[PDB]
Curated annotation (Swiss-Prot):
PANTHER family: COBALT-PRECORRIN-5B C(1)-METHYLTRANSFERASE. It comes from Archaeoglobus fulgidus (strain ATCC 49558 / DSM 4304 / JCM 9628 / NBRC 100126 / VC-16). The gene is cbiD. It is an enzyme of class 2 (transferase). This is Cobalt-precorrin-5B C(1)-methyltransferase. Belongs to the CbiD family. Gene3D superfamilies: CbiD-like, CbiD-like domains.
Length: 282
């Protein structure tokens, strides 16, 4: 059968009409639908990794594409514009109905001092650069691989030219992050949130009697561990749609997104017993 390499669900065998269907699915970049494909994007973390890897590789040859590892374990090929220690990579969000940082440019420059550094456009919170754990480990991982492959001993500074601006419309400034955007990504890929995806994933979830409706990757991991007999799915704030599923449903998510779906921290548990479905707030 054909299993999504990231979310791990199975695709209806009747949707697979293409000998190329598995290559796309196995790449983490495509979500097969009833009639076509949905394109996944790459996170700021993966785009940053690509920039760093391309900058190092470009020292000993012309680069136009690089392969980077991701937290999900699926290596992805990214198109870049690199030359002599300098790289420019644009993030793409696939079919996400609207990702504020889609198309944002990431620049990477090789420097003398060994290590990974973050410059302009990257926000700062509590005196530290706003790079999530996942993103940080991913970037370091690719940095190590590249340093060895290209016998590199220096370092790279990753920057976002329009980061400070784009940030002004990302609201993350009310979270303590100032002066730029955050670099993140739990899986390395951007889930293409739109109506088509919400409907497609519900249909995919129809192949399972018991399903865990989660808000994000962390929630999904929690459900995988605490509710193994439920097929874990990420529906974000689109819980109402997932609730149309006719089998056994369980809701797992963090306070932030659950109140957004519910309407308030108090409406969660109310909506819970009001739908006949347990809501696990982690």
């Amino acid at each position: 059968m054909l299993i999504d390499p990231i979310e791990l669900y199975r695709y209806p065998e009747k949707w697979i009409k293409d000998r190329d269907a598995e290559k796309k699915v196995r790449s983490g970049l495509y979500i097969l639908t009833e009639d076509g494909y949905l394109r996944r994007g790459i996170t700021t973390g993966t785009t940053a990794s690509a920039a760093a890897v391309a900058a190092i590789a470009s020292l000993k040859e012309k680069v136009e594409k690089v392969k980077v590892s991701t937290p999900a374990g699926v290596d992805v090929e990214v198109e870049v514009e690199a030359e002599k220690g300098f790289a420019r990579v644009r993030k793409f969000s696939g079919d996400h109905e609207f990702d504020v940082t889609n198309g944002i440019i990431f620049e990477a420059e090789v420097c003398e001092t060994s290590g990974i550094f973050f410059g302009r456009g990257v926000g700062v919170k509590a005196g530290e650069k706003a790079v999530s754990r996942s993103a940080k480990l991913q970037i370091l991982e690719n940095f190590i691989k590249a340093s060895r492959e290209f016998n590199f001993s220096g370092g790279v500074r990753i920057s976002v030219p329009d980061g400070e601006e784009v940030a002004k419309k990302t609201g993350n400034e009310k979270v303590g992050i100032k002066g730029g955007i955050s670099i993140l990504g739990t899986t390395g890929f951007v889930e293409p949130w739109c109506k088509k995806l919400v409907e497609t994933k519900l249909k995919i979830a129809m192949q399972y009697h018991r399903i865990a409706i989660t808000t994000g990757r962390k929630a999904w991991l929690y459900a995988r561990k605490k509710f193994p007999e439920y097929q874990p799915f990420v529906f974000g704030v689109h819980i109402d749609e997932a609730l149309k599923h006719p089998g056994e449903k369980i809701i797992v998510g963090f306070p932030g997104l659950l109140k957004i779906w519910a309407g308030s921290r108090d409406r969660i548990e109310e909506r819970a017993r009001e739908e006949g479905v347990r809501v696990v707030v982690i």
